[PDB]
Design a protein around this nucleic acid. Structure first.
Length: 49
DNA sequence: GGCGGCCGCTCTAGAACAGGATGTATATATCTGACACGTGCCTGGAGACTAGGGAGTAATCCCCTTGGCGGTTAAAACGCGGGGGACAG
């Protein structure tokens, strides 16, 4: 059971690390994820007046 | 001495309780009539073979629905007045 468990963990590790590499920096960004709409919502005319 | 208040007597009666009534649920006796087992086939699918063609998969592409916003006038919702109708009788 440990042998097959370690083998399955090893074959999980590559795809798991590949997903983590692209999802961790997305998880770090909080305001930048909503900045695609915040930069248009807060930067208008009437907001500036 | 007369009259209002209080309590006992008596008529009325609401509704639970017991007995009669009639159509079914059961307790055998026996018929009975299809039910399933056996037999004899015999007719339809399975092993095996020939050939092929429409989808799984891969690729493209372009398309089209979701997210995501201001805007503004149409309207949902809250509330006041009230009005006619569902239901109790």
């Amino acid at each position: 059971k440990d042998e097959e468990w370690r083998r399955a963990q090893r074959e999980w590790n590559k795809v798991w690390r590949e997903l983590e590499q692209k999802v961790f920096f997305k998880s770090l960004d909080h305001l930048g994820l909503t900045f695609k709409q915040a930069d248009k919502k807060l930067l208008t005319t009437k907001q500036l007046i």
